[PDB]
Amino acid sequence: SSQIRQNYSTEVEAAVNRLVNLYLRASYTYLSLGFYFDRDDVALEGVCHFFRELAEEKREGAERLLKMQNQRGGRALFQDLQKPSQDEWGTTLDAMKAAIVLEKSLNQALLDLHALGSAQADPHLCDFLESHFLDEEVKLIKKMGDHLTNIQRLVGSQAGLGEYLFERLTLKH
Amino acid sequence: SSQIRQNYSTEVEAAVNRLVNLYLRASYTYLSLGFYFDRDDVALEGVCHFFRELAEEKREGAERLLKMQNQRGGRALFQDLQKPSQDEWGTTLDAMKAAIVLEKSLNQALLDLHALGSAQADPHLCDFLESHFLDEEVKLIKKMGDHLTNIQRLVGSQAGLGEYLFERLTLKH
Amino acid sequence: SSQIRQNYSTEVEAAVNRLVNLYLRASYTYLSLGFYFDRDDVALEGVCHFFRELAEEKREGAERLLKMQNQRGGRALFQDLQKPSQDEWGTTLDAMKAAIVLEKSLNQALLDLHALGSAQADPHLCDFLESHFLDEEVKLIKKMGDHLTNIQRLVGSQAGLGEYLFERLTLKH
Amino acid sequence: SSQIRQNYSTEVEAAVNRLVNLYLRASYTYLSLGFYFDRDDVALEGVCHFFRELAEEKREGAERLLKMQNQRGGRALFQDLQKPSQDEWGTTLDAMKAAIVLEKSLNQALLDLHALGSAQADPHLCDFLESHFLDEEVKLIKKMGDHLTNIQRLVGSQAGLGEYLFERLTLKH
Ligand SMILES: [Cl-]
Ligand SMILES: [Cl-]
Ligand SMILES: [Cl-]
Ligand SMILES: [Cl-]
């Protein structure tokens, strides 16, 4: 058992393990989104790249949480990882809307954990979220929102043209 | 006559010579496709470049087969090369559909030769196809499929615009 | 739907998706093993590093399979990922024994898929496993076996001493 | 008298001066621990180096607090520095246990000051501790805990052997 644990509640420990699950779930979702846009009958490489990069980012966030759990003397506990919500993700617009929904849910979990940390007077936890998660998440959601606006502007009456142009001229490929 | 030939059937030797003919035919087809897209009244440089590169690739595949024939102590035998199926190749979409048909026929010839090799217990032949042909062909067909999907998405109600944009923004020029 | 799929059975497609699940499960197991050896009350950094590296390797194997699924025109389908078999992994010896069991199960899945590929006359699948999976797996299992032998030799009557020395002098830290 | 002081309570000012004393006390303790492990009849250079480095770190923490006191317009007030708790520090294990006790006491003083800052609505103080003290302290305690676990594992029935090996193979020398 740990000889280091100090000021680290069971409630925070448990919430950290749940958050890890949420981040790995998100990572899995992005993995599926990336490979859907790699299909020969979808074939939007920039969209594929965007979501593959997010899968790695979410995995890295989970790993940081797990590292922190150990630093504080809590015990990492892994649960089953549920499969993503869809097998096929529709259009770029559909996908980007789904990603924003997912990110808003992750963001709310971060805010909830921050509030728990605050209530438990755990300033290290609060600091950790502030320093490595909250601003990263705000910046990502702004980026997604910007992308959504551009995708929406391009639907017009020529959806295929607009979806191609967005992938070619906004996304890195 | 050869002093080296070992485990190399007449059936495989003949099938290798036929495959050489198929690859040189494919090369000739791509040569014609490249020069059609170089016409002043077609003028799609990226499409021209794509098919010219494929002509060279197919020629190189034939040359590898011929080198292997000699390595095994078989005798290269050349036949007439039939001219390509069309004199004019239509749209980029028409052309890319024709290329996929051609590649699927080459792929099936590779698979047939692999099966013959397997039946004749000729592991060098089998290895050779696995190592230099089968994955190269799968990768090319995936690329073509991706291109076809993008071309199809761009037809919309503005075909000329879409054909220009594909050539400018997907193909190397 | 795909316009490229050729010689790719439904049976192989399904087996590839199952294998992806097995590799991601293995990755998750190694993630848990790595963080267990990072606990302050375990504190074997070289062991942690070893299993973290394996988590990444297994993830990369899954990604290669998914890329290949798309190259062939099959459809990636993701399933729930079961949590690892244990929450706490015992000694270095216990852990390395569990890893070998896991690797032997992955190896047998690769061999089974190879046999299916052979039966379905799918030489691209067979080649793919030969070229990127079978030898990598044999090499990993040999490494694990070597490690197990060294760990076993060091138990003696001074288990803690031996476990420290193995981590310091065999594993990269 | 200061012309700058704003939102800086007398309670925080006093608590900052007390914390400075605690950090300089800790520095003095580590100085004594370092020179004990430099004795010819102890002679554990890596252990000496470890504690000498900590003496400098604790001094640097005090200096940062003093700099911040002045930045806020408070007045540094120095008190007597009590000598360390022991003249001789026993084994490496004894020493590392004493260091963890000391660090836990410093950590609790940081948490107490953070709570006071929070209650006094002094976000600069809170930020300062979060940014330069809380995570540094968590990381140090994790390191010490890891070291303690390794030292404990090496006691076995051959304490001298284990103490030598830890110093040679874990600590920088
Ligand atoms: Cl379960
Ligand atoms: Cl003739
Ligand atoms: Cl389900
Ligand atoms: Cl005095």
Question: TL;DR?
Answer:
Chains A, B, C, D: Residues 6-155 form the Ferritin-like diiron domain. The structure is cut from a larger assembly and holds four copies of chain A (173 residues). Chain A has 173 residues and is an all-alpha fold.
Structure description:
- The structure is cut from a larger assembly and holds four copies of chain A (173 residues).
- Chain A is mainly alpha-helical and 173 residues long.
- Chain A has one domain (10-170): Ferritin, core subunit, four-helix bundle (Ferritin).
- Chain A has helices spanning 10-37, 45-72, 92-119, 123-153, 159-169.
- The longest helix of chain A is centred in the last third of the chain and has 31 residues, at 123-153.
- Chain A is elongated.
- The structure holds chloride ion (CL) (4 copies).
Overall, the morphology of chain A is elongated
At the first level of CATH, the class of chain A is Mainly Alpha
Nearest-angstrom radius of gyration of chain A? 18 Å
According to CATH, the homologous superfamily of chain A is Ferritin, core subunit, four-helix bundle
Largest sheet of chain A: none
Quaternary structure state of the chains depicted: part of a larger assembly
The most extensive interface between chains reads: A-C, 29 and 29 residues
Helix % of chain A is over 70%
Number of domains of chain A: 1
Q: What separation lies between the terminal Cα atoms of chain A?
A: 48 Å
Please name the CATH topology of chain A: Ferritin
Please provide the ordered H/E string of secondary-structure elements of chain A: HHHHH
Q: Helical stretch count of chain A?
A: 5
Structural class of chain A: mainly alpha
Number of beta-strand segments of chain A: 0
Ligands bound, unique: chloride ion
DSSP strand content of chain A:
under 5%
Per CATH, the architecture of chain A is Up-down Bundle
